[PDB]
UniProtKB/Swiss-Prot annotation, chain B:
The gene is rpsS. Part of the 30S ribosomal subunit. Forms a loose dimer with protein S13. This is Small ribosomal subunit protein uS19. PROSITE patterns: RIBOSOMAL_S19 (PS00323). Pfam families: Ribosomal_S19.
Curated annotation (Swiss-Prot), chain C:
Induction: During stationary phase (at protein level). Also by cold stress, remains ribosome-associated for the 4 hours tested, then disappears when cells are warmed (at protein level). One of its GO terms (cellular component) is cytosol. Transmembrane segments: none annotated. This is Ribosome-associated inhibitor A. The lineage of its organism: Bacteria, Pseudomonadati, Pseudomonadota, Gammaproteobacteria, Enterobacterales. Disruption phenotype: Non-essential gene, increased formation of inactive 100S ribosomes in stationary phase, which persist longer than in wild-type. Double hpr-yfiA deletion mutants form 90S ribosomes. A quadruple yfiA-hpf-rmf-sra knockout strain is significantly outcompeted by wild-type after 4 days growth. No visible effect on viability or growth rate at 37 or 10 degrees Celsius, slight effect on bulk translation and timing of expression of some cold-shock proteins.
Swiss-Prot record, chain E:
Belongs to the universal ribosomal protein uS13 family. The gene is rpsM. InterPro entries: Rbsml_uS13_C, Ribosomal_uS13, Ribosomal_uS13-like_H2TH, Ribosomal_uS13_bac-type, Ribosomal_uS13_CS. One of its GO terms (molecular function) is tRNA binding. This is Small ribosomal subunit protein uS13. Keywords: Ribonucleoprotein, Ribosomal protein, RNA-binding, rRNA-binding, tRNA-binding. One of its GO terms (cellular component) is small ribosomal subunit.
From Swiss-Prot, chain F:
It comes from Thermus thermophilus (strain ATCC 27634 / DSM 579 / HB8). This is Large ribosomal subunit protein uL5. InterPro entries: Ribosomal_uL5 (IPR002132), Ribosomal_uL5_bac-type (IPR020930), Ribosomal_uL5_C (IPR031309), Ribosomal_uL5_CS (IPR020929), Ribosomal_uL5_dom_sf (IPR022803), Ribosomal_uL5_N (IPR031310). Pfam families: Ribosomal_L5, Ribosomal_L5_C. Belongs to the universal ribosomal protein uL5 family. GO terms for cellular component: ribonucleoprotein complex; ribosome. Gene3D superfamilies: 3.30.1440.10. Part of the 50S ribosomal subunit; part of the 5S rRNA/uL5/uL18/bL25 (TL7) subcomplex; has also been isolated as a complex with 5S rRNA, bL25 (TL7) and DNA binding protein II. Forms a bridge to the 30S subunit in the 70S ribosome, contacting protein uS13; this bridge is straddled by the 5S rRNA. Contacts the P site tRNA. The gene is rplE.
RNA sequence: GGCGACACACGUGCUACAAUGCCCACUACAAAGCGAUGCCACCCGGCAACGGGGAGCUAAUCGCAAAAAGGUGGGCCCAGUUCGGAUUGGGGUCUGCAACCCGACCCCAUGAAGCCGGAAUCGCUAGUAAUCGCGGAUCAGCCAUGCCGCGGUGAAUACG
RNA sequence: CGCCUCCUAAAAGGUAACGGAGGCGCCCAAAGGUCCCCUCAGGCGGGACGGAAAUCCGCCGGAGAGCGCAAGGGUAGAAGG
């Protein structure tokens, strides 16, 4: 590389919210991030976050069976 | 809307007509003047003709249209825009 | 904007527009015709055209009567013109003494 | 706020009660 | 982009700041700050990464939010419109949905005044 | 050369799995990363404030490498383009730096993307190369809210010695590129 | 079923655009009326609308009842905001044979326009205007922000 | 009405008509000298804002691009960048 135009890369630890620490390289030695691949829903199996719904609708109301036959 | 405590409302006289169709093995058009009626899980797959005030309107009933009333799918007002 | 009322009568968008056309005769005087109102009605002896209009210097209120609706609409306009012109020039009446 | 049901002041106005104005 | 996808206003009280997330009003605000034991009075610019991640962790996991909340509202309307119910119709014309009078007014649904 | 986790992962985990999966008869036939070419189409700096030294800075923080300028090949009316105008950046990452970039793209950047639902399965060149676009640079661990004047995205070309898409999906997937379908 | 339509236009009003203000809480002072399948204390369930219990009263007794602005304390700090509360999603409560068209209320979420309004134009001369709440008639419920009343605090200004 | 390019012009040069078509009366301090380096248009496929067309990646692509301006000749084994 040409001298004097490039930000030096040094060993660098990125600290995610799941409490993961990544040993990589950056122009900054230590980084805090809110999320990473280790804890991200799309990555992590299929963590169905807040909606483990099973839809739930629409047949599935069931309040109830009390109308006569 | 109509209280969770009280029943799910269908006019009785439509339900009988539905249930009779279930037994003998369906299916023909059911003329009705019951917009007040809930669509009900046993109604799914029919096509009921609902009155708007002038016309009895064909509504094929589907799985996704279940909690809604009968009149919701037979509109009461003709409107093609202004001018 | 301009509003027309047809009392106990059915009138066409044509007739409505014809009223706008006759009323525009008032734009001659070049002053703001504010929320002009035309009313059309059929009395026993002929039609009546009433109108009430506010301008920066006052109100025009007048009424036409004729066996013919179009003719009454016109007579309405005359009465309106005369009043409007009286509004616009009465102020000039006494610059001396 | 008199038009904001979600306040005390709203419910006095609408003449009603709830979480936001209790009796 | 702190919580959750949005960088909530610093300089603000956490109870208020959180309200600047799509899907979190006064209510859900007071609720999270209890379930994670933080003071509402604390300015966001004063939160421990600790206090922060507690907040973040809970909030993202208990309630549907931002893009996913919108998708559902879209999806809900999407279906209402396609099944052909009367509420679907009002959406299909951009008109009001809750029985309001449309002879006058109705301006928020309609947009500002359209010439004739 | 640097020991970087992803580089190692390639030699250790990915090389073999690939040879298994396609039965290569020569070590050089197995798919390699050639270059990652990052581009900023920009041109919001055409006349305006061609101080996109701010972006060149941002890009150089992300890659550890200073981009070079791109200028218009011809004059264009409707986009307002005098020929020779500075309208973009491009940084060609190779070797160790390419790996480091990807390492963090894969670990950290893509995760931070809004409503991320996986990379696009169909953005495959058809000669075994892959391309994907970002909307914002706040995705990278190095660029904080504090430092940015305005949201700008980028184009990422990842170039591979594989002859076919089918092989490239494999290499990129094994390495850890998350695909939606 | 409609009278509740909706490219548009006009009249009447409500709520605002904020710090003489907004929110939370603690705490005061009215009057006129209304009330037996009627008003409902108190106890319990629910964040709540409300539900279940259940005493009193033909009512100067008992109840609707809390008056609100106000006062004390706390937050907000000039931001389309802790302004504004429109629109919309979802979830409930009630009346009623029945709330698609088309009821009201509650709660979560949404959080519009609006930064004081061109031409023009309304009211009011004192307990008035402005602001603030409470009742009633109609009425199952209610689109009442309408109407008829009732008190609270309480100005400015009239050469002519 | 002078000058340039093509055709007429009969495969050397030349060759008329109030014959058929266009241009000049400038310009460039680099748009000049030299050394070094580089190669186009266009088609398909791929890529945030981004479109027929901005910039990026891939494959094809001998010159159809470029060469200040008309036309012609020339030209990437460069006269182009
Ligand atoms: Mg008269
Ligand atoms: Mg004046
Ligand atoms: Mg508010
Ligand atoms: Mg919010
Ligand atoms: Mg309506
Ligand atoms: Mg493909
Ligand atoms: Mg390749
Ligand atoms: Mg960042
Ligand atoms: Mg009516
Ligand atoms: Mg108006
Ligand atoms: Mg009103
Ligand atoms: Mg009463
Ligand atoms: Mg806003
Ligand atoms: Mg605005
Ligand atoms: Mg607000
Ligand atoms: Mg202001
Ligand atoms: Mg004013
Ligand atoms: Mg005011
Ligand atoms: Mg006004
Ligand atoms: Mg008087
Ligand atoms: Mg007020
Ligand atoms: Mg009242
Ligand atoms: Mg009533
Ligand atoms: Mg309504
Ligand atoms: Mg000459
Ligand atoms: Mg010749
Ligand atoms: Mg010749
Ligand atoms: Mg010759
Ligand atoms: Mg010859
Ligand atoms: Mg010779
Ligand atoms: Mg000649
Ligand atoms: Mg000439
Ligand atoms: Mg040069
Ligand atoms: Mg030269
Ligand atoms: Mg040179
Ligand atoms: Mg090309
Ligand atoms: Mg393309
Ligand atoms: Mg695109
Ligand atoms: Mg393109
Ligand atoms: Mg050429
Ligand atoms: Mg030329
Ligand atoms: Zn993580």
């Amino acid at each position: 590389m040409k001298e004097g135009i490039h930000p030096k890369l040094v060993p660098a630890r990125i600290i995610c919210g799941c409490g993961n620490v990544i040993e990589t390289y950056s122009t900054k030695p230590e980084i805090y991030v809110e999320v990473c691949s280790k804890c991200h829903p799309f990555y992590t199996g299929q963590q169905r976050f807040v909606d483990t719904e099973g839809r739930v609708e629409r047949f599935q109301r069931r309040y109830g069976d009390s109308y006569r036959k | 809307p109509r209280s969770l405590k009280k029943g799910v409302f269908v006019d009785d006289h439509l339900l009988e007509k539905v249930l009779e169709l279930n037994a003998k093995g369906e299916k023909r058009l059911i003329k009705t003047w019951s917009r007040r009626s809930t669509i009900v899980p046993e109604m799914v797959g029919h096509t009921i003709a609902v009155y708007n005030g002038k016309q009895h309107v064909p509504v094929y009933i589907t799985e996704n249209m279940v909690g809604h009333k009968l009149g919701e799918f037979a509109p009461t007002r003709t409107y093609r825009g202004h001018g | 904007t301009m509003n027309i009322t047809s009392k106990q009568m059915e009138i066409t968008p044509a007739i409505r527009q014809h009223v706008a056309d006759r009323l525009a005769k008032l734009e001659k005087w070049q002053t703001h015709l504010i929320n002009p109102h035309i009313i059309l009605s059929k009395e026993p002896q002929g039609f009546v055209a009433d109108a009430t209009i506010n301008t920066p210097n006052g109100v025009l209120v007048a009424s036409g009567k004729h066996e013919d609706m179009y003719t009454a609409i016109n007579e309405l306009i005359n009465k309106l013109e005369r009043q409007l012109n009286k509004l616009q020039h009465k102020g000039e009446a006494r610059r001396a003494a | 706020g008199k038009g904001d049901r979600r306040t005390r002041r709203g419910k006095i106005w609408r003449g009603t009660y709830g979480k936001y104005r209790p009796r | 982009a702190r919580i959750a996808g949005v960088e909530i206003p610093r300089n603000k009280r956490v109870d208020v700041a959180l309200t600047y997330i799509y899907g979190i009003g006064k209510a859900r605000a007071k609720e999270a700050l209890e379930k994670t034991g933080i003071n509402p009075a604390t300015r966001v610019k004063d939160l421990t990464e600790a206090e922060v991640v507690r907040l973040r962790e809970y909030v993202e996991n208990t309630w549907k939010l931002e893009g996913e909340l919108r998708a559902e509202v879209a999806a809900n309307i999407k279906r209402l419109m396609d099944i052909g119910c009367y509420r679907g119709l009002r959406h299909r014309r951009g008109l009001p949905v809750r029985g309001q009078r449309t002879r006058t007014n109705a301006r928020t649904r309609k947009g500002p005044r359209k010439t004739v | 050369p640097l020991d970087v986790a992803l580089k190692r992962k390639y030699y250790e985990e990915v090389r073999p799995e690939l040879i298994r999966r396609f039965g290569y008869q020569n070590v050089w036939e197995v798919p390699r990363l050639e270059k990652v070419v990052i581009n900023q189409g920009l041109g919001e700096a055409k006349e305006d404030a061609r101080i996109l030294e701010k972006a060149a800075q941002e890009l150089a923080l992300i890659t550890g490498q200073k981009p070079a300028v791109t200028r218009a090949k011809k004059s264009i009316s409707n986009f307002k383009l005098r020929k020779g105008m500075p309208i973009g950046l491009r940084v060609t990452l190779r070797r160790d730096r390419m790996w480091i970039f990807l390492e963090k793209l894969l670990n950290v950047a893509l995760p931070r993307i809004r409503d991320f639902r996986g990379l696009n399965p169909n953005s495959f060149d058809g000669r075994g190369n892959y391309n994907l676009g970002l909307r914002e640079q706040l995705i990278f661990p190095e660029i904080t809210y504090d430092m940015v004047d305005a949201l700008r995205g980028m184009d990422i070309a990842v170039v591979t010695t594989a002859e076919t898409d089918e092989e490239a999906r494999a290499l990129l997937e094994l390495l850890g590129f998350p695909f939606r379908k």
